Structure formats: structure tokens, C-alpha cells
Design a binder for these strands. Structure first.
Ligand SMILES: [Mg+2]
Ligand SMILES: [Mg+2]
Ligand SMILES: [Mg+2]
Ligand SMILES: [Mg+2]
Ligand SMILES: [Mg+2]
Lengths: 206, 150, 129, 81, 184, 87
RNA sequence: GUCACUGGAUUUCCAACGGGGCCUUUCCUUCUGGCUAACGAACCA
């Protein structure tokens, strides 16, 4: 059901390798073994970016079809993933959460951070696990940016990236935002790249 | 697991899935059966025979290519021994241990193992007695069996 | 040492369904595994299964659809008088209206509904539901 | 995991598995053909052979046994099968 | 040589093949001295899904090792001399019935001489070269069965075209159903 | 569950897990239903039209919600060359 | 037919379910009998 236009394209495979997403974790994991392509010498595992890409598309496919675009919740408590998920929130409806998730957000209707999303997106399942876990109490699906070593528990449809840091987290969120805008939305002819620089999603700090 | 110890070891031969073959060998079984009986008259057991054949001569396994397992062959040619080489070695060990127990009576571990060995022997002999490879009595005896190895 | 080998089969099956697996490797195989698997298939409690040939006792790989709660063996295999089959089905089956006690009779391995219709009895074998 | 082809596992993981743990068990041992240059005679030795093998004559050597594959001695040629 | 190489005086095809045998017996460095001891019991005709008909030659048993030394040669010239036919050699094996309180016989009954050993010998003769490297059996969700025979990779040319034939050879004999596959 | 004359009793019939084909209980709160958008040619996902899956809490608990999506998506023609039926 | 009890299936529905026979390499052996082969290969009850 996926047209040949949806195929990888060399432009995108450039951004990913430039962003170094394909570089994977040394300790792999049993559930993340399919996303491995091959291991480098000196113990560095090469993620299969075509599987990276296709998942990203399937992920962006599910963000889409959520009837109200604000319900989709992008969560990062990591610094690298913070300015990323704010931008994803600005383009797509997507009410975000950066830094502290605070517990009792999906449970505990009396709290001020209360949400009832119909989807959750998570940069790091390890660091964000509070959100994944609460998610599992309310029947909420979850998208996850995962490395090779990441908790698979209560996460549907993971996107293998890098997630140790640098540009990969920014890219996968950038590309995520790009593809949900092409799907439904208005971008309309994915043939042409994006006006928006991918460096808008990134970590800042000084 | 192990009978007389706690060992769970699985170390064993995996016999290939083949009835026939190796497609390459084609050395004409009566040619190997000849080599079988030669080593038989040379004073070898079926066990060390099929190893010598497997190491130097090819001969993956003699049940294949000759249609008959090694011991059976020695019997049809009449080289079959009195007590099976099964038993022969157990009684060999048992006698070899008891000789050690005679000069050292203070070795209790030796006294322990001799029990284990002779237990194995009476079980084995019962079997061979049931299927009538041994006479209806037989019954390994500690004093007498020293000559049964020699 | 192995004793039943049916009881190892229905165990690996019942263990796998519960862990959510869709397929199970059985070993060894035997005519009674086959016949049991057969009465289980023909009511739909498993998918198809495929015997493997190793030159010794065989293996089996069975495909599990879910929908099976427990498949289990009764050891020892008790002689079951014909009226007692009612009494067996009451104990170990979840309701009168479904589930199967499976016997072994001179008329062949079957379930108790068949044996009821064929008016036959013998040693009980296991259950499935 | 949770659904897989047991009837057709990959030949990469079936090769790394233990001898008896293959879908159907089978030996990992091979056989050789060996000549020393001093005789034209061919001798076929089993890879793991426990007996120190000589060719038909001359008592050179062929292999010496170990806990693993027999060790072929010095210069010799060995083909497979 | 015409009627003697037959043994049981009929029939049409067998005499036809008999004259195709002796014809090949004309060359005698080898192709005569080797072919003469090997006679056969009889033959059967069986259709295939393709328009080509299958010719299955029955063989006496222990002679079966003689037809094996030739085989390739003999089935090459027989498929030459009779074109449009697939030629295969099957040994005729006695099947004794499973003893019971009703069908029972003295002298035990050997393993070979059992229905399953014979049907497991048919699969071995039908393919004749290219030893079987495995087997399966599919137990289908509707209650039927399919033997999957796994053939070797060497010299599988000598068979490749006849695989839909062997199948229908087996089905008219046994009542069972076959499939084949190759290693990789 | 039918009754005496052909009639539908049993006030409700639960969903079934797509991976396990196990009933999804009303109190199963780790259970998840996934809605994937259907596309017309060149993007533009169709609103109101989904290819949907339902997973049981057990599977999402066990860590298999990911690999079971893949096997399902490829089967239902979502992905290609991701999931592998042999290992 | 009385406005739950009862009489029958028009070989056609559909369906299941169970029983007995045969055929396929296959009911072995014996005893009695029937007919027959050039003294009782066969075959049948
Ligand atoms: Mg690094
Ligand atoms: Mg063990
Ligand atoms: Mg012990
Ligand atoms: Mg003990
Ligand atoms: Mg069904």
C-alpha cells in the first residue's frame, strides 16, 4: 500500500548518515536484534537505516489519523531531545512535554499536568520511562526513539536511531515532523525537500 | 544424568543423517570386512577397531557400507569373545582397583569407588544374563575375576 | 528419565500458548503425540503441525493460534468404565457444552464425544480446552 | 521472538549452534586426503582422528591426536572429502 | 533373448522394452556383458500432469544393485528409444500384513517387509541417484497429509524434469501424496 | 453466545488481540489499539479511514509490542523488508 | 389430526452421526463339504 515515491531516496539517506543515526549501541539487546545490520570492527553496531526510515514512516503514519493534532504528546526529559520536541509541537498540533514529566500526569485527574493523549512519542524510553509506565495504565499507545539498548516494554513501533546524542535525535524528530506534514496536512509533493532547516530541531545549551 | 555421579555431560557422537554413502568412498564392503577380521585376529576390540578404521581408512561407520555392526561381524567369523568388551573393561578396572586396595587399606575413596564399579558390573551381568549372552549363572566374583582379565 | 513423552509434548505446548508464542518445537515424537495433536487440530485448538524426520524418534513443530486454554495429560492412564466418562468430564472440563476429554480405546484414540457416539471406552489419555 | 520459522531457521545461527542442537543433528567433523611428498600413496585421515596415522609404509607420521582436530604434521597436502 | 528376459509371458510394452534392451546389448565391450544378467518382472504405465506418460519398470530385488550400476546409462537410452516417457526402476517388495489376532503368521515378520519400510524404499528407488537428505510430513488443517521429500543438490539434473512424475508415480501406488524441495 | 431460539444474549463481545488472539478484558489497561492512516496516492492520509491493530497487555508488557507490530504491518502491507520470519 | 399431544415422508435438499461389507501386495491356518486340474496344483461354499 506504500507507493514507490515513499521509498528511502538518496537525499534522506544522506541526512541520516551525516547525522550519524546508523551508529548503534555496543550492548545490543534481544528485542532490537532485527534493526541491526552488521557490527563494525571495535564493537560498534550499524543500524539499518532503511529499517530506520520505514519505521519512521509507519510512525509518522500513526501520528497522522489521530483526529485532533494536539492530542499527540511528544515527550523528552533529555536535554538533547528537548528543543527537538518543542519544534515538533510547533509544526504539528502536538501538545509537548519537555524535561520533567511529573508523575500522575495520565492518571490522577486532579493534577495540573493532567493529559489524556491518544498517542505518546518518546525520545528515550530509559530516561522517560515514567511516561511510558503511566502510559501503560491508561491504554495509550507509544512511539519510541530507541537505540539498540533500550527498554522495549510497553512501547509499540520503535524507531531505531542513535540516541546517545548529537544530531540523530534532532534529525529523527525533524524527519518525523516533516513526514506527518506531508501526510494529510499541507506539504503536498514530497518530491521537494523542506524549507525548514533540520538544525532548528537540535540541543542548544550555551 | 550420569549414573554413578552428578555429571550432566552430553558429550557424544552425532551420527549423520545417512543410511548409505559417503558417495565418494565406494571401497566395496567385503574389502572392509576383510580389514575388520584382520584387526580382529590381531587382538582388537570392536570399539578400537572402528576407531582405527575411522581414523586411517575413511570408513565413516561400519554399520553403514557393510550393513552390519562391528561386533556381529566378528561373531559370524567367530572372533566373538566370551564376556562382552563392555563387561571386560569394567571387571578390568574393578580388579585393577582392588589390587590397589590391597597395598593401601587406608584409602577410603578407593574403597568407595570399588563399590561403584562392582555395582555397575552386577547390573550389566544381569542384563547380559537376561538376554542370554552369559550363562544362567555367571555372576562376577571378586577373587576369581583376576584371571578373567588375565 | 522421560516417562510419558505425551506429557512433555502438551507441556511445551501449554507453556508456549501462555507466553504468547505462535509455534512450539516438540521432541521426541510418537504415534500418540500425533493422534493427540490430530484430535486437537480437528477441533481447531492448534494449527497445522509438521513432523520432522531425524533418523531416531522425530520432532514436531506445531503452530498455535491462541484459543487454547489448557491441553493436558492424565497419568496414570486409568481404565475408565463407560458410565464414568460422564464423571471424568465433570471434574476436569470447564463446562458441559464444550471442551474435550480424549481417551484411548480399542476403537482408537478419540475424544469422549466420539467415544460416546461410538459407545466405546478404555484408558483415559488427556484433556484439551 | 513470539513468532518465528522453526522449520527454517537461518543457516547462520544453525552453524553457530551446538552439534546436537541443530534442527536435525549431525557431525561437524570432516575427512582429509593426505600425501607426504616421499610417497605417491594417498591416505584418507579423519579430521579428529585419535590414532597417530601413518601412510601405507615408511612410518613417517601423518597426524598426532589432541583434544580437538588431529594436528597434521609438517608439510603435507590435505583436500576435503 | 526376446521372451526370456521377461519372465511371465505378457505383455506388449515389456516386449517392446525387451527389444530396446537387446538392441542396446549389441555393443559388447561393456553394454552387453553387464546388461544380460539383469531382467525385470514387469512394467506399469501412469499418466502425468503433463502429457508425458510414466513407465515404471519392476525389478526382482537383489538384482536391484545391478540396474543401479547401469541406471543413468539405461534410463538415458530408454528415454531416447521411448521418447515422451519417464523411465524409473522400482524393486518389487513383499509386504507382509501387521500380525493380529486375525491376520497372523509364524516366523515373526522382519522390519523390511513392513508397509512403512517398503513405502520408504519406494521414495528411495523413485529418485534413484541424489540421496534423500531429509524429510518432513505436513499435517494439514483439514486432516490430510503431505510428505515433503528433501532431495540432494548433486546431479539433481538426472531427476529435475521428472519430479511431477515421481509424485504421480507415488500416488497411484501408495495412495499418499508427495512434494519435493532442494537444499540451499 | 446464542440462546434458545437463535438469539443473541451475552451483553458484550470483547475485542481480540491481534498478536495473540486472546480476549482483551475491560480492566486490561495496558492494552493498546493502534490506528494507522490510509493514504491516497502521493500521501494525504485519509481522515476517518484506518488500518487498525489491537495488542494485549501481556504483549506490551512482555516487550513484544514492537516486533509483533512489524510482523503484522508487513502482513497487512504496511512495511516491506523490515520484519523477518526466520532467525 | 385437537388449534401443548399425535400420523407420514413423495429415494433430493441441506446436514451431520454411527453400523456392516468389499477393493487396493492383505482373511492367516485347519476341519468338513461343493465342482474341477494330467493321484487330490487350483477355485468356491
Ligand atoms: Mg559512540
Ligand atoms: Mg541430559
Ligand atoms: Mg545420580
Ligand atoms: Mg542412581
Ligand atoms: Mg475451526
Amino acid at each position: 500500500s506504500l507507493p514507490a515515491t515513499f521509498d528511502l531516496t538518496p537525499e534522506d539517506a544522506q541526512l541520516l548518515l551525516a547525522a550519524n543515526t546508523h551508529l548503534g549501541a555496543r550492548n545490543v539487546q534481544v528485542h532490537q536484534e532485527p534493526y541491526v545490520f552488521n557490527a563494525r570492527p571495535d564493537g560498534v553496531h550499524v543500524i539499518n537505516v532503511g529499517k530506520t526510515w520505514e519505521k519512521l514512516v509507519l510512525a509518522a503514519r500513526i501520528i497522522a489519523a489521530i483526529p485532533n493534532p494536539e492530542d499527540v504528546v511528544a515527550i523528552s526529559s533529555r536535554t538533547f531531545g528537548q528543543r527537538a520536541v518543542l519544534k515538533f509541537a510547533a509544526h504539528t498540533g502536538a501538545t509537548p512535554i519537555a524535561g520533567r514529566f511529573t508523575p500522575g500526569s495520565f492518571t490522577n485527574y486532579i493534577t495540573r499536568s493532567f493529559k489524556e493523549p491518544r498517542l505518546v512519542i518518546v525520545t528515550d524510553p530509559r530516561s522517560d520511562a515514567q511516561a511510558i509506565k503511566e502510559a501503560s495504565y491508561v491504554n495509550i499507545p507509544v512511539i519510541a526513539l530507541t537505540d539498540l539498548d533500550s527498554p522495549s516494554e510497553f512501547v509499540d513501533v520503535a524507531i531505531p536511531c542513535n540516541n546517545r546524542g548529537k544530531h540523530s535525535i534532532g534529525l529523527i524528530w525533524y524527519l518525523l515532523a516533516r513526514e506527518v506534514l506531508r501526510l494529510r496536512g499541507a506539504l503536498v509533493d514530497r518530491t521537494q525537500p523542506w524549507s525548514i532547516m533540520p538544525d532548528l530541531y537540535f540541543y542548544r545549551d550555551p | 544424568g550420569r549414573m554413578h555421579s552428578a555429571g550432566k555431560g552430553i558429550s557424544s557422537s552425532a551420527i549423520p543423517y545417512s543410511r548409505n554413502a559417503p558417495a565418494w568412498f565406494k571401497l566395496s564392503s567385503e574389502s572392509v570386512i576383510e580389514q575388520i577380521v584382520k584387526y580382529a585376529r590381531k587382538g582388537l576390540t570392536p570399539s578400537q577397531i572402528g576407531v582405527l578404521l575411522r581414523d586411517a581408512h575413511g570408513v565413516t561407520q561400519a554399520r553403514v557400507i557393510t550393513g552390519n555392526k562391528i561386533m556381529r561381524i566378528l561373531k559370524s567369523n567367530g572372533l566373538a569373545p566370551e564376556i562382552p568388551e563392555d563387561l571386560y573393561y569394567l571387571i578390568k578396572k574393578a580388579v585393577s582397583v582392588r589390587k590397589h586396595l590391597e597395598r593401601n587399606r587406608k584409602d577410603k575413596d578407593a574403597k568407595f569407588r570399588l563399590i561403584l564399579i562392582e555395582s555397575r558390573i552386577h547390573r550389566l551381568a544381569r542384563y547380559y544374563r537376561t538376554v542370554a549372552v552369559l550363562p544362567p549363572n555367571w555372576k562376577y566374583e571378586s577373587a576369581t575375576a583376576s584371571a578373567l582379565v588375565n | 528419565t522421560r516417562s510419558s513423552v505425551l506429557a512433555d509434548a502438551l507441556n511445551a505446548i501449554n507453556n508456549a500458548e501462555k507466553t504468547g508464542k505462535r509455534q512450539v518445537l516438540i521432541r521426541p515424537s510418537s504415534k500418540v503425540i500425533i493422534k493427540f495433536l490430530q484430535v486437537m487440530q480437528k477441533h481447531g485448538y492448534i494449527g497445522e503441525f509438521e513432523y520432522i524426520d531425524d533418523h531416531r524418534s522425530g520432532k514436531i513443530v506445531v503452530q498455535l493460534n491462541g484459543r487454547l486454554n489448557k491441553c493436558g495429560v492424565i497419568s496414570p492412564r486409568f481404565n475408565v468404565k463407560i458410565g464414568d466418562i460422564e464423571k471424568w468430564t465433570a471434574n476436569l472440563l470447564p463446562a458441559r457444552q464444550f471442551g474435550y476429554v480424549i481417551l484411548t480405546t480399542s476403537a482408537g484414540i478419540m475424544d469422549h464425544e466420539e467415544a460416546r457416539r461410538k459407545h466405546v471406552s478404555g484408558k483415559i489419555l488427556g484433556f484439551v480446552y | 521472538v513470539l513468532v518465528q520459522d522453526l522449520l527454517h531457521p537461518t543457516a547462520a545461527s544453525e552453524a553457530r549452534k551446538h552439534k546436537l542442537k541443530t534442527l536435525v543433528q549431525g557431525p561437524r567433523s570432516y575427512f582429509l586426503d593426505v600425501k607426504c611428498p616421499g610417497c605417491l600413496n594417498i591416505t584418507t585421515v579423519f579430521s579428529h582422528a585419535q590414532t597417530a596415522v601413518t601412510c601405507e609404509s615408511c612410518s613417517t607420521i601423518l597426524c598426532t591426536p589432541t583434544g580437538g582436530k588431529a594436528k597434521l604434521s609438517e608439510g603435507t597436502s590435505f583436500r576435503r572429502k | 533373448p526376446q521372451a526370456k528376459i521377461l519372465s511371465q509371458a505378457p505383455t506388449e510394452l515389456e516386449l517392446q522394452v525387451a527389444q530396446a534392451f537387446v538392441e542396446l546389448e549389441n555393443s559388447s565391450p561393456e553394454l552387453k556383458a553387464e546388461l544380460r544378467p539383469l531382467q525385470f518382472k514387469s512394467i506399469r504405465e501412469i499418466d502425468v500432469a503433463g502429457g508425458k506418460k510414466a513407465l515404471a519398470i519392476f525389478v526382482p530385488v537383489p538384482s536391484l544393485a545391478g540396474f543401479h550400476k547401469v541406471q543413468t546409462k539405461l534410463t538415458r537410452e530408454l528415454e531416447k528409444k521411448f521418447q515422451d516417457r519417464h523411465v524409473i526402476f522400482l524393486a518389487e517388495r513383499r509386504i507382509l500384513p501387521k500380525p493380529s489376532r486375525t491376520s497372523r503368521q509364524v516366523q515373526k515378520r522382519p522390519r523390511s517387509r513392513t508397509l512403512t519400510a517398503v513405502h520408504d524404499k519406494i521414495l528411495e528407488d523413485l529418485v534413484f541417484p541424489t540421496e534423500i537428505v531429509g524429510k518432513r510430513v505436513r499435517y494439514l488443517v483439514g486432516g490430510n497429509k503431505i510428505q515433503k521429500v528433501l532431495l540432494d543438490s548433486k546431479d539433481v539434473q538426472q531427476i529435475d524434469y521428472k519430479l511431477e512424475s515421481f509424485q504421480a508415480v507415488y500416488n497411484k501406488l501408495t495412495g499418499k501424496q508427495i512434494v519435493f524441495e532442494i537444499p540451499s | 453466545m446464542e440462546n434458545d431460539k437463535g438469539q443473541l444474549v451475552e451483553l458484550y463481545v470483547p475485542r481480540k488481540c491481534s498478536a495473540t488472539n486472546r480476549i482483551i478484558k475491560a480492566d486490561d489497561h495496558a492494552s493498546v489499539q493502534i490506528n494507522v492512516a490510509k493514504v491516497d496516492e502521493e500521501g494525504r492520509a485519509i481522515p476517518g479511514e484506518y488500518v487498525t491493530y489491537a495488542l494485549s497487555g501481556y504483549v506490551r508488557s512482555r516487550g513484544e509490542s514492537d516486533d509483533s507490530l512489524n510482523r503484522l504491518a508487513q502482513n497487512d502491507g504496511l512495511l516491506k523488508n523490515v520484519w523477518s520470519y526466520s532467525r
